[PDB]
């Protein structure tokens, strides 16, 4: 029974998470540092799976194996709390998220049925340098934990977690960062998703949103109408020549937050260079030819579970948005217009970084889902959403 | 990560 608020979570016990190097939910933390020492001998044997299941590292460069992972996630990954929509990460998106600079094949950790070889579980790690308050640490980011619906509630997820932990330890890394919609010991920060309608007619039709407080449909479409072209002078897609200045802009901008990525220039290229239907980045190049701002959002459609025939909910997720000369409000207004132009139905953003300064003004509505941020084997004070400067996939 | 929709 996963908890979604900390009031529900503070009641229950965590048989697995109590055994792990994370702070207790009750804890107020005032120190900064590891919970347990770096290990100088690591278990060489994989952890034991239930009878009939085996480990398999997934080579995603094999298109057949990538399709197997795509299918596992398409049928069993995260749903909304009403079981009406399920994320539909594309194979090309999965390659973007799972093969960044430094990726390792043993960190694409699958579980297969022994007799049929069917893929029924997965978890992944990717390397990341993380800045947390006054410390920079090489960590991994853990994502795409998924157990087949037919295999749920058999304690397979703790085995997946211990096994990726072991495989990361073997590479000399003893901290991780991750996000989840559920409350576990112990969030370092809690963010909330907000939603900006772009195609309100379709969102109402699929019951992603509802005609609120009796306005007509006519009145709703006019309320959410956007200009057909952006307003900021010099806005254009990011190009190869912009990689260094985007890296420079992002690095200085992120210093004001307390949990942030520390990206090399090669990582900036990976995470921001535009790729159709995966990642969009637009820069502002001013009258002097200098790039002074940039906006970015990634593509994440969702299956409509009750009518899986009726196309899909096309959503854009705000990524990193850096402003030094264009007002952030204007930059995000342009982000909405570009997402509308590109055929997105909704534009999603969290309330982290400086996002609360524009959410209400740009007619975002508050969502029903939280996003909790976590660190593994790092005990530090929690922080408000506006100090979180990290966006995962 | 988390699938949210408008309240
Ligand atoms: C140094 C390196 C360290 C690296 C590791 C760092 C930590 C990484 C941590 C993972 C980061 C993930 C980041 C993402 O990818 S968050 C996305 C998670 N994926 C989904 O929500 C997809 C849909 N759901 C599923 O596929 C299953 O329901 C999952 C796989 C989630 C659980 O399978 P199942 O439903 O069959 O449960 P069980 O009986 O096997 O096991 C129940 C135990 O599992 C605890 N549980 C439930 N949900 C989560 C969760 N989302 N994170 C951590 N723990 C979770 C639960 O509280 C209980 O522990 P405790 O209550 O007894 O204590
Ligand atoms: Cl705290």
Ligand 1 pocket member A165 (CB < 6 A): yes
Measured CA distances, A93 to A51, A70, A234, A317 (Å): 33, 10, 28, 13
Structure-solving method: X-ray
Q: Looking at residue A151, what DSSP letter applies? A: G
SS3 content of chain A, % helix, strand, coil (to 5): 25, 30, 45
Residue A371 contacts B where some CB pair is shorter than 8 Å? yes
Q: How many CB atoms lie within 10 A of CB A270?
A: 18
Residue A267 to residues A4, A190, A250, A264, A270, Cα–Cα distance (Å): 33, 26, 12, 5, 5
Rounded to whole angstroms, the Cα distance separating A23 from A279 reads 35
Q: A32 and A135 in contact (C-beta within 8 Å)?
A: yes
Q: Mark A355-385 as b/e (b = at least 16 C-beta within 10 Å).
A: bbebbeebebbebbbbbbbbbbbbbbebbeb
CA–CA separation, A163 vs A158, rounded Å?
8
Following CA atoms A59, A62, A68, A71 in sequence, which dihedral angle do they give, to the nearest 10 degrees?
110
Cα–Cα distance, A186 to A379 (Å, whole number) = 9
CA of A192 to the centre of ligand 1 (A): 20
Residue to mutate, A79, A123, A157, A181, ligand 1, most ligand atoms under 8 Å from C-beta: A157
With 0-12 / 13-18 / 19 or more C-beta atoms within 10 angstroms meaning exposed / middle / buried, residue A106 is: middle
- Beta bridge partners, A373, equal A179, A189
Q: Which residue has the tokens 């900064």?
A: A32
Closest C-alpha among A136, A216, A194, A158 to residue A367: A194
Contact A131, A260 (CB under 8 A): yes
Beta-carbon separation of A365 and B7 below 8 A:
yes
Report the binding-site residues of A.
15-17, 144-147, 153, 155-157
Residue A141, domain CATH: 3.40.630.170
3-state secondary structure A97-148: HHCCCCCCHHHEEEEEECCCCCEEEEEEEEEEEEEECCEEEEEEEEEEEEEC
Half-sphere exposure of A240 (CA within 13 A, CB side): 0
Contact indicator for A323, A333 with CB cutoff of 8 Å = no
Q: Which of A232, A235, A346, A328 is nearest to A281 (CA)?
A: A235
C-alpha A271/C-alpha A284 separation (Å) is 18
- Residue A123, CA distances (Å) to A1, A49, A75 in order: 20, 14, 15
Expressed in angstroms, the distance from the first to the final Cα of chain A is 24
- Which two tokens mark A52? 């009939």
Is-cis flag, bond preceding A186, omega within 30?
yes
Interface contact flag, A80 B1, Cβ < 8 Å? no
Pairing outcome for strands A312-318 and A346-350: parallel
Q: Which of A170, A100, A122, A178 is nearest to A377 (CA)?
A: A178
CB atoms within 10 A of CB A287: 7
CA A17 and chain centroid, separation: 22
> How many angstroms separate the CA of residue A303 from the nearest CA in chain B?
12
Q: How many domains does chain A have?
A: 1
The domain of A132 spans 2-393
- Alpha-carbon distance of A312 to A304, in angstroms, equals 6
Six token digits for residue A322:
């850096």
DSSP structural state of residue A291: E
User: What are the φ and ψ backbone dihedral angles of A214, each rounded to 5 degrees?
Assistant: 35, 80
**Is residue A252 within 8 Å of residue A217, measured between CB atoms?**
no
What is the number of residues in chain B?
7
DSSP 3-state of A326: coil
Q: How far apart are CA A264 and CA A268, in angstroms?
A: 6
């Amino acid at each position: 029974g996963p908890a979604k608020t900390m009031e529900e979570a503070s009641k229950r016990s965590y048989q697995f998470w109590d055994t792990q190097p994370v702070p207790k939910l009750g804890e107020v933390v005032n120190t900064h540092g590891p919970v347990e020492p770096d290990k100088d001998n690591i278990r060489q044997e994989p952890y034991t799976l239930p009878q009939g299941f085996t480990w398999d590292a997934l080579d995603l460069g094999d298109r057949g194996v990538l399709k197997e992972l795509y299918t596992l996630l398409n049928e069993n990954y995260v749903e909304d709390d009403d079981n009406m929509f399920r994320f539909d990460y594309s194979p090309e998106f999965l390659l973007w998220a799972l093969r960044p600079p430094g990726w390792l094949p043993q960190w694409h950790c699958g579980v297969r049925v022994v007799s049929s070889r069917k893929l029924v579980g997965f978890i992944s790690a990717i390397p990341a340098n993380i800045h947390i308050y006054d410390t920079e640490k090489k960590m991994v980011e853990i994502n795409f934990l998924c157990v087949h619906k037919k295999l749920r509630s058999k304690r397979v997820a703790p085995v997946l977690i211990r096994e990726i932990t072991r495989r990361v330890h073997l590479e000399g890394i003893f901290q991780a960062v991750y996000t989840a919609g559920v409350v576990l010991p112990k969030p370092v920060g809690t963010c909330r998703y907000w939603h900006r309608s772009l195609n309100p007619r379709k969102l109402i039709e699929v019951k992603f949103s509802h005609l609120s407080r009796n306005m007509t449909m006519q009145r709703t479409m006019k309320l959410y109408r956007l200009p057909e072209t952006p307003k900021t002078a010099g806005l254009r897609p990011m190009e190869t020549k912009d990689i260094p200045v985007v890296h420079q802009l992002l690095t200085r901008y992120l210093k004001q937050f307390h949990l942030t990525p520390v990206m090399s220039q090669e990582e900036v290229e990976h995470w921001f260079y535009p790729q159709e239907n995966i990642i969009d980045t637009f820069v502002v190049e001013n009258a002097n030819g200098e790039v002074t701002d940039f906006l970015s959002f990634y593509t994440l459609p969702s299956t409509i579970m009750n009518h899986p025939t009726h196309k899909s909910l096309k959503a854009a997720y705000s990524f990193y948005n850096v402003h030094t000369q264009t007002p952030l409000l204007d930059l995000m207004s342009d982000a909405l217009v570009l997402a509308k132009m590109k055929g997105f139905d909704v534009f999603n953003a969290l309330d982290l970084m400086e996002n609360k300064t524009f959410l209400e003004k740009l007619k975002f509505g508050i969502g029903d889902g939280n996003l909790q941020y976590y660190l593994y084997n790092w005990k530090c004070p929690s922080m408000g959403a506006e100090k979180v400067g990290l966006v995962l996939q | 990560x988390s699938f949210s929709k408008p309240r």
